[PDB]
Amino acid sequence: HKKGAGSTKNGRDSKGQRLGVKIYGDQVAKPGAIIIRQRGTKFHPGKNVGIGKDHTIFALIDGLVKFEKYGPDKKKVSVYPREIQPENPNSYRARKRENFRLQREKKK
Template sequence: MVLARLQQPLRVAITSIGRSGSSQICLHEALAQLSVRAPPTLTFVRHASHAQQGAVNKAKDGPGKRLGAKKTGEQYVIPGNIIFRQRGTHWFPGDNCAMGRDHTIYATECGYVKYYKDPAKHPKRQYIGVVFERNQVLPLPPNSMRRRRLGMVATKMEMPEVIETEPQIEVLADGQAVQVQKSTDKERKGEEGRTLRLRPGYMYREANWEIGRAAERAKVKVREFVPGDRWKAWRKSNARKAKTAEKKGLGRSVKAKK
């Protein structure tokens, strides 16, 4: 392209040189005619575009996270069962439920799922709870009895009927009459007349001297304590250890001779 542009100025310069007589003037004119003006330069600025960044920033359509309810109302669950998966606290944990780090609500006790609202606790929040019987309703009324825990069922205790016995009168040797009240409950052997008191450390127990008289109360014959035999077991153990060490020493000496 540059050579094609220079062809016409060169022809004109050559013809002018041939016509004119002065070589110096013709040379200046030829150089002047040869001066080619450069076209205006165009500057381009390249801006970033979405297509130039690669496939990382393209639109994605990943798999769903399977959010929502996993257990319906009155469905039986065990501890650890997931009841509801969510992003944010659309539902809050109620009775016998807890919330994980990703706002997942799961059961902490065995029972039946209940979806409910508690205006007394919060007017707008929705709760998920677990009850132990299908016919129970949440929320519980204020100051109501606490439900069972640890797999135990609350039952009414039946108190045994108290049978009143007529007092018996016993006549002593000196002719004095004494009223004797016999208890209907059978006492274990050696526990006659025990008195349990609250001792230090919040323990109900007898004093040490009373515990030592248990055999006497049970009328059990015990060998009398001999002061000289206090260290008898200790002396026996020392004699046994000395005899064992002597046998080991004899065995080593026989091996050394061989």
């Protein structure tokens, strides 16, 4: 009734190395910000963009990230600064942060 249990020859792994897209498409970046840790060139380097020893793709300039279409079934990544970025005190966020600030000041 009490038979022996056979050992395995498995049970080894490496904890997920945390690759993938760090800075997404149409998003803020920096000079030096790592955009993608990819194991090979899944995405390819575009304009304004360095490519490192590990095929790590990082931005050289400010601006928003762009994942372009390369030609025959591949992907690029370029970075573009943005011209004018308007802010209106009309809006809800602007209204509410000024309301909050004014409450803070009013209390103390």
